């Protein structure tokens, strides 16, 4: 529209009504030029690609992408406060983006002396892939994502994919993707982009953790009607061999009949807090549980959802079962543990077997006269009928969303860092300066602009009659340096500890 | 009547490649568990996982179930000398009747780079492949992965297994056998079954 | 536990009269209910007599919303996790129910 | 600001029985382990037991069977149940706070040095 | 259990004065030492955590310095303050917590 009007206004807040929180957020964003305009074809030979499980073959492209796909771009400590001491469950419901206020400058570099100034004809390319025809990196937990704290001003990450491989080399089947072959809105510094998104119906997250336990469901006053096998011998000599039968009842709660079964379980490592207990060994890769697929070793991380640890066991932790985050300033590699907040879902426990425990014994055998009864551990279990589980919880610094792949069939999809899985994910949002040529030789550019996104969010009401008070999430009453959830004397903005949804309660 | 339609394509992706190759993630893992040297060096230190180690970046979606057949070689010199047929097959009891396990859960054929081995009872032989899936899916003659068998300590060093056979998890997926051969099979009247389409490949159908 | 209103005393003049123990002072507050068992005589000689009844009550109590743009978290009332022989506000093995603490309402925060 | 102050103590004959208790006062006290050491009179800093936020428990050997450490989280207190009391447990026994603690979601990382201590209370066995 | 020897058992200095106290130890501990001066009837403070670490409220002239098996404490502008027991833990090996057997300044 024109040069010196401003194309959009800055919206962040949220409104509570009802039983819909709609957040708004807006961040000033700086765009550079990657690969100098050019798709380059990487892999990990460049890199030196020692390992056969490391080996990827792939491109990087000019583009960049907005990302949203954190909690804490949405919400701010007090707004998610705010939902998970008074509500049960939460989804997403519409999405708007806007793009505004774009800016253009050239860099010039004269002797020693850079100079910037705007360039008025400039322009920028956006395009948002909503036939889902690009490889989708969002729902990979990466880094780049819209800052937690308003004021803070962030870069673009650059876009890339992967392809199929043999080593470092690529296979026949092996896509390429040129990213100019979409049609994207191309921007002067007067407009502006949006659109507008509507999540599709996704079940909502359980922000509650069971006030009872998978196998405490019964009433302790009352015997069942049900008979188990109490005794096989009357006492010890010879041809003792009997059959004795009793009530199972309140007395004996551990043999009882039970309509259903803890759910799934794939064995982890047990970590300890304490260095000196730990094996005086490496053991981070080795004994790691891993999934492999065609050839290649995975990790398991963080995989299914299980139980921390046991009642009682704060210290212990699985070795890759639990999401870990970094505290603001952590180091890049080898970092302590006093550097990093390791998440624990100790609260799925009632329904979810212990990450570090074995699921339970099985008979291997039959017995007979000359054969004592065996028994042996599962470590794994799949599914079976009558299992019921709660699915990973989500962190205000954790994932949003991912995208269900696209397969013939999927169990459960929900995925396993935690959110909501989606088969059409918002869609991922491309941006870049389009070359400007001074052809391999062009002028030094960069653009910056502000962007908001607004969400749409379904509560789920409390409509609890426990008698005593709830378990809430607060902050600290007493003195200290600095206010938690605050910036610093140089002004840096930290979250001091990772923070759960699951405070209230529910029955099982 | 309505049926999903059959995928006739091949990934273009594999399972754990998925994410970006430029950025890292704010997940970290466990990088060092001793200093290094002898006794007494142990710690706990944590790495951002990112574009230079692929394998221990935290995935939300892991591959299908497994049920492992034994590998056979079409060069017979390599293949063991003696009679493992019936013996060193895969298969499934019922009432007491073994019942060879064929052509059974859809797995990957064999590895990338081996294509002179083929699972026992794996593949239909009219001797058809599988590779396609082999990005979503388990090898057929490979493990599906390692779990711990213990708990570790100061005293007791950690110690895995291998998983022979893996049921399903949540978040998995998978694809199914590919047509080429039967079209429809008739769903078994039960109370109840998992994912219907048959195995022999096509479509499954309650009529 | 405490109370809810009082009953401003009628007087000439009264400063900000809201009740010292706390709660809400009013000129007509909720008006006293009298019960007595009308006697039945066997005159000082009477039937030996008690009444018993269900009663109940029901208010209406408005709300005023938190407003508040404060980035950081509140404090909260919160129960504590750690392992104990009762639970607090509940019964105990005897049937005896007890409230452990004196709660306040004062937990949020606004600017002065 | 941060206080502890530890109550019982006093004379006991040997295999009697003491109940030392340490009020907490300035930190919410449910977020942090807890530790008794004693210094035996004229004689060098020992410690006796520790217990978490979330109840890991620890003793000493010399000490261990004898004494059991415990928390109340509603009245701000330590408690150690000292039995079979001997005459190499007459000391002065504090009560020192681990200041580590990440939050309700996390793992703490127990420090195992104590910031805070109390001003102790004699126990003597004779 | 890890043993620690502070090695001069008893030091005499004088106001201003450099002071320097160091401990070893039987097996490494890597960077966990920790320094406490206790004066006669009074608790210990923390003066010094994580080998070469200071806690808050404590005067800048306290130091420390080492890893592995050896520690040094050293006091800078000794004044009349300071003259302490001064004891060296190690929170490395847990359970149980060490303590050195004790420094006294004169």
């Known amino acids: 529209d024109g040069v010196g009007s401003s194309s959009g206004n800055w919206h962040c807040d949220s409104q509570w009504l009802g039983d819909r929180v709609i957040t708004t957020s807006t961040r000033t964003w700086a765009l550079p030029t990657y690969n100098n305009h050019l798709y380059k074809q990487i892999s990990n030979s460049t890199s030196g690609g020692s390992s056969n499980d490391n080996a990827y073959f792939g491109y990087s492209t000019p583009w960049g992408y907005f990302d949203f796909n954190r909690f804490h771009c949405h919400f701010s400590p007090r707004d998610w406060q705010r939902l998970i001491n008074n509500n049960w469950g939460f989804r997403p419901k519409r999405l708007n983006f806007k793009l505004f206020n774009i800016q253009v400058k050239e860099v010039t570099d004269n002797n020693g002396v850079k100079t910037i100034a705007n360039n008025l004809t400039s322009t920028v390319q956006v395009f948002t892939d909503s036939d889902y025809q690009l490889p989708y990196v969002l729902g990979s937990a990466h880094e780049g994502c819209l800052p937690p704290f308003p004021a803070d001003v962030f870069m673009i990450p650059q876009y890339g994919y992967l392809t199929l491989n043999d080593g470092s080399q690529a296979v026949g089947r092996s896509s390429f993707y040129c990213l100019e072959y979409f049609p994207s809105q191309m921007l002067r510094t007067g407009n502006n982009f949006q659109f507008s998104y509507e999540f599709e119906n996704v079940p909502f997250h359980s922000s509650y953790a069971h006030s009872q336990s998978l196998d405490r469901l019964m009433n302790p006053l009352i015997d069942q009607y049900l008979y188990y096998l109490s005794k096989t011998i009357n006492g010890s000599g010879q041809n003792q061999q009997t059959l004795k039968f009793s009530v199972a009842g309140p007395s004996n709660m551990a043999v009882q009949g039970r309509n259903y079964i803890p759910g799934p379980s794939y064995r982890q490592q047990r970590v300890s807090t304490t260095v000196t207990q730990n094996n005086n060994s490496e053991f981070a890769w080795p004994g790691a549980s891993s999934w492999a697929l065609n050839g290649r070793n995975s990790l398991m991380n963080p995989g299914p959802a299980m139980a921390s640890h046991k009642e009682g066991e704060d210290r212990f932790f699985p070795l890759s079962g639990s999401l870990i985050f970094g505290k603001q300033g952590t180091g890049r590699d080898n970092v302590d543990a006093d550097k990093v907040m390791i998440t624990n879902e100790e609260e799925i426990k009632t329904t979810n077997p212990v990450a570090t425990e074995s699921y339970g014994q099985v008979a291997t055998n039959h017995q007979s006269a000359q054969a004592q009864a065996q028994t042996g551990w599962v470590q794994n279990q799949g599914i079976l009928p009558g299992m019921v589980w709660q699915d990973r919880d989500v962190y205000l610094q954790g994932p949003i969303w991912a995208k269900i792949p696209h397969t013939d069939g999927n169990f459960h999809p929900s995925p396993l860092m935690g959110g909501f899985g989606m088969k059409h994910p918002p869609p991922q949002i491309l941006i870049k300066n389009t070359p400007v040529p001074a052809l391999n030789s062009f002028i030094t550019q960069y653009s910056t602009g502000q962007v908001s996104v607004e969400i749409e969010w379904e509560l789920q009401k409390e409509n609890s009659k426990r008698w005593n008070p709830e378990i809430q999430y607060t902050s600290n009453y007493y003195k200290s340096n600095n206010v938690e959830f605050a910036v610093n004397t140089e002004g840096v903005y930290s979250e001091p500890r990772p923070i759960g949804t699951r405070y209230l309660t529910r029955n099982l | 009547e309505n049926v999903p339609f059959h995928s006739s394509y091949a990934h273009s992706q594999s399972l754990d490649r998925l994410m970006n190759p430029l950025i890292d993630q704010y997940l970290y893992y466990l990088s060092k568990t001793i200093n290094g040297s002898g006794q007494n060096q142990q710690t706990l230190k944590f790495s951002v996982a990112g574009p230079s180690n692929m394998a221990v970046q935290g995935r939300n979606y892991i591959p299908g179930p497994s049920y492992r057949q034994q590998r056979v070689s079409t060069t017979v010199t390599q293949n063991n000398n003696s009679e493992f047929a019936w013996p060193g097959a895969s298969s499934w009891a019922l009432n007491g009747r073994n019942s060879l396990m064929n052509p059974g859960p859809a797995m990957a054929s064999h590895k990338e780079g081996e294509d002179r081995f083929f699972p026992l009872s794996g593949s239909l032989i009219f001797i058809t492949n599988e590779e396609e899936i082999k990005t979503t899916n388990p090898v057929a003659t490979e493990s599906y992965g390692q779990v711990a068998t213990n708990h570790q300590s100061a005293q007791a060093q950690a110690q895995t297994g291998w998983v022979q056979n893996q049921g399903i998890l949540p978040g998995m997926v998978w694809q199914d056998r590919d047509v080429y051969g039967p079209i429809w099979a008739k769903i078994p009247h039960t109370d109840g079954n998992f994912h219907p389409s048959p195995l022999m490949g096509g479509f499954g159908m309650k009529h | 536990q405490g109370p809810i209103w009082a009953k401003i005393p009628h007087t000439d003049g009264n400063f900000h009269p809201s009740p010292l123990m706390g709660g809400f002072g009013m000129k007509h507050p909720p008006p006293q209910i009298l019960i007595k068992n009308t006697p039945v005589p066997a005159l000082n000689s009477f039937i030996t007599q008690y009444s018993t009844g269900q009663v109940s009550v029901e208010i209406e109590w408005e709300l005023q919303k938190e407003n508040s743009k404060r980035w950081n978290p509140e404090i909260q009332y919160t129960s504590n996790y750690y392992k104990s022989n009762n639970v607090e506000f509940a019964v105990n093995t005897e049937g005896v129910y007890s409230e452990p603490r004196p709660i306040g309402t004062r937990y949020l925060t606004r600017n002065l | 600001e941060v206080q502890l102050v530890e109550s019982g103590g006093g004379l006991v004959q040997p295999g009697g029985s003491l109940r030392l208790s340490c009020a907490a006062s300035?930190?919410?006290?449910?977020?942090?382990?807890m530790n008794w050491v004693r210094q035996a009179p004229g004689k060098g800093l020992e410690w006796v037991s520790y217990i978490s936020s979330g109840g890991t428990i620890y003793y000493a050997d010399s000490v261990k069977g004898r004494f059991t450490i415990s928390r109340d989280n509603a009245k701000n207190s330590v408690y150690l149940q000292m039995n079979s009391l001997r005459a190499e447990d007459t000391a002065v026994y504090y009560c020192?706070?681990?200041?580590?603690?990440?939050?309700?979601?996390?793992?703490?990382?127990?420090?195992?040095?104590?910031?805070?201590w109390g001003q102790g209370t004699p126990v003597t066995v004779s | 259990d890890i043993q620690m020897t502070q090695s001069p058992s008893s030091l005499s200095a004088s106001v201003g004065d450099r002071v320097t106290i160091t401990c070893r130890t039987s097996?490494?501990?890597?960077?966990?030492l920790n320094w406490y001066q206790q004066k006669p009837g009074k608790a210990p403070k923390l003066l010094i955590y994580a080998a070469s670490s200071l806690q808050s409220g404590v005067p800048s002239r306290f130091t420390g310095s080492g890893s592995g098996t050896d520690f040094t404490l050293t006091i800078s502008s000794l004044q009349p303050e300071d003259f302490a027991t001064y004891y060296c833990?190690?929170?490395?090996?847990?359970?149980?917590?060490?303590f050195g057997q004790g420094t006294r300044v004169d």
């Open positions: 020192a706070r681990d200041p580590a603690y990440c939050g309700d979601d996390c793992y703490t990382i127990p420090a195992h040095y104590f910031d805070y």
């Open positions: 833990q190690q929170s490395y090996s847990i359970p149980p917590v060490t």
């Open positions: 097996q490494s501990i890597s960077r966990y």
């Open positions: 300035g930190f919410t006290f449910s977020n942090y382990g």
